């Protein structure tokens, strides 16, 4: 299992607020990270999950938390989608492209026979330790609010060991 | 990963409403199941999580959803803890004891250094397929209400496949 | 080399004229096929090659030649690119999505460190045999006309076997 | 068997007179130790074996001996069972929790089928050498006094090597 | 450990009251058996353990029990030692020779370093299941009577399963 | 395919204008190269592809492009073929002999059950990188004019990166 | 060595008197065969060994012995060589082409770092058994008269077993 | 095979003239040795063979040849058998006990089904090289006199190498 | 070890009383066999051992015992030697040639770095069981008389199990 | 093939003109060597081949060519055959014994099922390279004259390298 293990090194391109950048594990060192995996861009499922995380982005940045959405589409696809979907256009966090599937396989989150990642969210602390894991099948939504909660809770525990 | 896979056979002793019973994957077939793993009985940690599931058990049973709490403690320990804690006494669902760690390992949820299961919840549909997973580190709490919402959602998609977006 | 070998079984989702279909090697049996690989949808380079092929599509269908463009993007991406680009909008042939990379690996055409397919074109006869292969680096365009010429020439050979000179 | 071999290192949590402590091979160096393995806390069987040992405890501590009861239950469970049981409440020695089962396995005393240790008592000298072993099935009792005789002898033979007839 | 497992088959030569016989797992089926392992014949240590068992022998035979002393010495040696020793001459039970060491190994009771078995006593029920085990180092004595108590209990628990408190 | 990989080291004998020379990868460093593989000399098939490449050899050379034809025949055979065929007589570029099939296998271009190379053309840039690959079955011809266009496009892209048409 | 073993199955194209034929092991069954391997056609070395075997081909045929020369060149090359050399023009026995080197490797006669066969002659009897092997380095010639003597001795021993000189 | 090979290290307890000693390959270095293996002490078999070696021991010692009888019985058993049998009591050479079977296996001489050594004799020269081997089945006897003859011969060739034939 | 094990199958040529024959394990079935290995024919060591066995051949045949001398020389060499040595000329038993070394390796009796057999004698009963083994280094002779003895003894035991 | 390869190290005993010597690859360094293999000494066929070579020995030594006949018989056998056969008695070159078969296997010339070497001749130059190989079946004689011719021709080549024609 991945709970309480250190994330692995990775180098991927991403689209963030209009620009293409490179993201590596080194960019997460010293910060709280949220890796939000989803299956694919441009499908016919409601973009709900991604938009809700965006709504809470304001607050997450205030807690020193970075958000990285991840799919096996290229960063090019993320850019296009960011212009086609009003829900996705709200995204200001980095949208990582994982065409090789390496970032996804890092978190053992690949649907091997589909070439797409499963709907999984991971919460990683400044030291690269996964503190919270959430995975659901298609149609079973992830609650942004509950994610926030888990994160604040994850932060408390880091500053108040045992109680 | 475990998401979208079928649970594995198992055979454990559990404490359910005063008596000792035996649970196997057989009991889960044809039903919706929630496996709620936790680290340990009789610890200075607030049993809030188990009590909270207890609070939703009635609505859960009403929806055809069984609940099994799991720990590497024996089922004898669960009996004692049940007739000892005001919060644990509210539990009417089965409390599986997994001292071989087998049930816990089937779900790849063992803290190999402590011999205790991690804080994880799994939702299993009638065909034995895992549809929802949740694991948290010590101190991070699980919201029974959130669990309930997902279960309803999982039950909805089983009934309404390919629900495109309006 | 893959020249003169039989293509391998595959099963992919594709986007064809507004509809989503499934393509497998069965669909190629008895026909002449062109598998046109390219790296990715929605990049910044112009889809000239794909468009050039669209222009000759009608003529290719006359020769009984089916065309399947392939990239590791999903068929969903193809539908969106098709309705966002004038050039892509001209495409009437099937656009296969290969997210698992299996189709691309069947033709040993994957840039493993990129997860994208190389710019390679394969001409397959009715018996499933590869008769022509073309691969180029970014910037070196594949000419649809030379492609037609090769196909007619391959079709000729199949009709007039062992033609001395 | 493990007879006459040196105990393997270990580190476990334990309950001893209202407090949690940590035991390791270190606490046994240069000391006569007794390891008392039993299957489970809060069972329905009579805690006789543990309590019978509890009694002879004062005498033991005198002979320079230490008592460690060991179960695959956590030490949290031991503290609890030391409050709901008269017999268990008499235990002044350390009650070790072995949830990972490592301590039990070091002694090859694990019922792999149940995840519970078998009924075995071991006698370890100050050098960490097992001098006496006793294993009995569920129901057959272990004589507290006989164990004492074993210690006496083990201790004598330790002082007066080679006692030819 | 071997506690609660079925003894492995075997075939050894033995000395019993002036005659050589052959013992096998067959002779233990449907019978309470006691296996008494000791290091060596004609040693300088006191044959007390063997003779102390010899005494309680009549009683044992009554409870439907059988006694088998086992040593890695051949059975020829056992006949001899039963003529030069008063204590050994009291043995009316079978004295098994285990030169190949197979019987000792079945019970994982071999000092591989010496080629001699350790001091271990086993109690096997009619089903061939080990109910009690006792291993002690050179010098620490095995209580003949305590063994009897173990048999009594083992036998009771055999008759009256589950004796909840 | 071998697209975008560096050619492997090699050492072969060749026939170049009445002479026998040795060719190695060093000969290609800093230059644009075209490795033209064909099945066999002295066969009954029209040596069209080879004569066509010969015709454009003038143009190619003006572009700084070297041409090397390759087959599993020995260089001795090339020297012979060059005296009996009017077409092959037009050839002025080096005709490499690859009897061990090492060069051929380097470009993964061997018909293993024949011991003959397949009809393939490779364009290799000054740094030894393969920029264009073409393989065809017997009967399907290779167009030298389309090769030239590719070569010029490869040189243009090398000289002017990221100047590709914008969407 | 391969002495006293049966030749392995094979299928090659050859040039035999202005014609292209296929040769397999079946062609050798029931006959006496001579497989004459050489390095390459059209080289600068005197085709002595091949012309010498040609001269004695009359005699050999009168003895029921078939001759097959073999090299890694293709049969097309043999047909060509047969028109440019007066010596090779004397050849009337089949000239086998072995481009895949399979025949050559069957007789463990390949110079692996050259893709060329070594100078070796094998005498194979009607049952396909190798009765005589001869391999020489470049420059050391093979004597056709000594080959004939060996062939006749092989036939004599086949016809009259155990008639060897007594000590 | 063992002929012409060097014996292997070993360490055993033995009974020699009333006392217990320890023998190792160390004691054999620089000396001529005879390892005389036999199946078992206190058996209804006639100890004739051991007694016969005893009879030649004096001449053997005179020639610088040590003798070690070997059995898988313990050295305690040898003491008893020595002060019990009139024939075995004539033995003044070491009686090695090999209950681990190690010494016996070094000479590849174990009857794996009985845990007893086969009837075999080995002659080892000062450099530890085996120069003579002899093994027989139960009932076939070894002639101590023949053994003596070979030893003298072995000692002769060590002193006179390459003795061609007259 | 080989004591009390069954001999292995073998097929070798041999010289016996002027004629070349073939010997196989099947020729030993039902009889008592003596396999007498020696290093080499025509050396400068006294042929003593072989001549003494010959002197006792008369008697051995009377006990139903066959004798097979064995060396890695060919049967041809044995013939020649049988004509050159007056000691060897007394031999009427079979002299087996073992050029391949297979018979020798059967009895694990090969000096691998010399390609010659060690001086070893084996006694085999009607059932193919080796009852007696004797091996010596060069210069240490084998006594024919002692061999005879062992054989008679081997025969007694076969007809009087235990005593 | 072994043609054009360097011989391997070897160490054998040989019989040469009444004396026993040791031969190793060192003895071949700097000289021209002929390794003449044959199946066996003392068979019934006449030693014509060996004798034919003896006849040309003097001439071979003039060319600086050493000759070593080889068979799997021992050198002892060679001494005896030499003084029992008129033909063999004419031999002045070294007769190597190869009882281990190592020399014969170095030249891959062993008939494994017979333990005898095949009728093969190898011409080795001063640098240890095999320049000529000849192998024949029983009954097909190897002509010493053709052998001389080949050697002179090989020697010529070494003197006049790459001589065109």
Swiss-Prot record, chains A, I:
Substrates-to-products reaction catalysed: a hydroperoxide + NADH + H(+) = an alcohol + NAD(+) + H2O
Superkingdom, taxonomy of origin: Bacteria
Active site: 46 (cysteine sulfenic acid (-soh) intermediate)
Subcellular compartments: Cytoplasm
Single GO BP term: hydrogen peroxide catabolic process
One Gene Ontology CC term in the entry: cytosol
Annotated ranges, domain Thioredoxin: 1-156
Main localisation: cytoplasm
Record bears the keyword Magnesium: no
Record-level Gene Ontology MF annotations: NADH-dependent peroxiredoxin activity; thioredoxin peroxidase activity
Function comment: Thiol-specific peroxidase that catalyzes the reduction of hydrogen peroxide and organic hydroperoxides to water and alcohols, respectively. Plays a role in cell protection against oxidative stress by detoxifying peroxides.
Classification via NCBIfam families: AhpC
Misc: The active site is a conserved redox-active cysteine residue, the peroxidatic cysteine (C(P)), which makes the nucleophilic attack on the peroxide substrate. The peroxide oxidizes the C(P)-SH to cysteine sulfenic acid (C(P)-SOH), which then reacts with another cysteine residue, the resolving cysteine (C(R)), to form a disulfide bridge. The disulfide is subsequently reduced by an appropriate electron donor to complete the catalytic cycle. In this typical 2-Cys peroxiredoxin, C(R) is provided by the other dimeric subunit to form an intersubunit disulfide.
Quaternary structure note: Homodimer; disulfide-linked, upon oxidation. 5 homodimers assemble to form a ring-like decamer.
Protein name in the entry: Alkyl hydroperoxide reductase C
Swiss-Prot record, chains C, D, E, J:
GO molecular function: NADH-dependent peroxiredoxin activity; thioredoxin peroxidase activity
Signal peptide: none
Active site: 46
One GO biological process term: response to oxidative stress
Enzyme Commission number: 1.11.1.26
Leftover remarks: The active site is a conserved redox-active cysteine residue, the peroxidatic cysteine (C(P)), which makes the nucleophilic attack on the peroxide substrate. The peroxide oxidizes the C(P)-SH to cysteine sulfenic acid (C(P)-SOH), which then reacts with another cysteine residue, the resolving cysteine (C(R)), to form a disulfide bridge. The disulfide is subsequently reduced by an appropriate electron donor to complete the catalytic cycle. In this typical 2-Cys peroxiredoxin, C(R) is provided by the other dimeric subunit to form an intersubunit disulfide.
Subcellular location: Cytoplasm
Full protein name: Alkyl hydroperoxide reductase C
PANTHER family registered for this protein in UniProt: ALKYL HYDROPEROXIDE REDUCTASE C (PTHR10681:SF121), THIOREDOXIN PEROXIDASE (PTHR10681)
Assembly mode: Homodimer; disulfide-linked, upon oxidation. 5 homodimers assemble to form a ring-like decamer.
Known catalytic reactions: a hydroperoxide + NADH + H(+) = an alcohol + NAD(+) + H2O
Job description of the protein: Thiol-specific peroxidase that catalyzes the reduction of hydrogen peroxide and organic hydroperoxides to water and alcohols, respectively. Plays a role in cell protection against oxidative stress by detoxifying peroxides.
Organism field: Salmonella typhimurium (strain LT2 / SGSC1412 / ATCC 700720)
Membrane spanning residue stretches: none
Keyword Nucleotide-binding on entry: no
NCBIfam families documented for this protein: AhpC
Domain Thioredoxin: 1-156
Gene from which this protein is expressed: ahpC
Keyword Nucleotide-binding: no
Gene Ontology CC terms, in alphabetical order: cytosol
This protein's UniProt keywords: Antioxidant, Cytoplasm, Disulfide bond, Oxidoreductase, Peroxidase, Redox-active center
UniProt family annotation: Belongs to the peroxiredoxin family. AhpC/Prx1 subfamily.
């Amino acid at each position: 299992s991945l709970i309480n293990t250190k994330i692995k090194p990775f180098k991927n391109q991403a689209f963030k607020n209009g620009e293409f950048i490179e993201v590596t594990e080194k960019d997460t060192e010293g910060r709280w990270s949220v890796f939000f995996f989803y299956p694919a861009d441009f499908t016919f499922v409601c973009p709900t999950e991604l938009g809700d995380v965006a709504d809470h982005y304001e607050e997450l940045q205030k807690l020193g938390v970075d958000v990285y959405s991840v799919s096996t589409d290229t960063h090019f696809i993320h850019k296009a989608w960011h212009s086609s979907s009003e829900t996705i256009a709200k995204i200001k966090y980095a949208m990582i492209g994982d065409p090789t599937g390496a970032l996804t396989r890092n978190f053992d989150n690949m649907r091997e026979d589909e070439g797409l990642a499963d709907r999984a969210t991971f919460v990683v602390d400044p030291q690269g330790i996964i503190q919270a894991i959430e995975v659901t099948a298609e149609g079973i939504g992830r609650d942004a609010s509950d994610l926030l909660r888990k994160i604040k809770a994850a932060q408390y525990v880091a500053a108040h060991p045992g109680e």
